[PDB]
């Protein structure tokens, strides 16, 4: 019946020298769909999990992660809302919108971002 999903984002600071050639990202993010802490698993009731992205990452925009974890990883240099669409497995979707968070250590070790917290019926 009821379930907490958590929709959050990890970042790590890219030094320069450690930057591509062709890539101009300051940061490696990832952005995670999980449950609460005493269940972090969430596979046996989501089915896939859709982020929607900025237009900047066209034509790949639109990333699609069935098998768990559903995590996404990207480079960028900039927040932007990111939509993620859960998809259950008997029911039904829901959006949620996650404003991404960028690391500002600057260590070059990946830290919490945010976390976006929501409650769903089913």
């Known amino acids: 019946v009821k379930k907490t999903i958590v929709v959050g984002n990890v970042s790590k600071y ?10 101009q990202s300051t940061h490696k993010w990832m952005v995670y769909v999980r449950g609460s802490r005493r269940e972090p698993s ?3 009731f989501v089915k896939k999990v859709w982020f929607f ?12 992660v069935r098998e ?3 995590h996404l990883t990207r ?4 927040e932007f809302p990111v939509r993620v669409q859960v998809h259950f497995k008997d029911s039904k ?6 404003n991404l968070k960028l690391d500002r250590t600057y260590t070059g070790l990946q830290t919490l ?8 019926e089913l």
């Open 14 to 23: 890219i030094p320069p020298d450690k930057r591509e050639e062709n890539d």
């Open 68 to 70: 768990p974890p559903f």
């Open 113 to 120: 971002g945010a976390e976006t917290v929501v409650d769903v």
């Open 42 to 44: 969430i596979n046996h």
């Open 93 to 98: 979707r829901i959006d949620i919108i996650h």
């Open 53 to 64: 992205l900025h237009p900047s990452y066209k034509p790949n925009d639109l990333v699609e």
């Open 75 to 78: 480079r960028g240099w900039g």
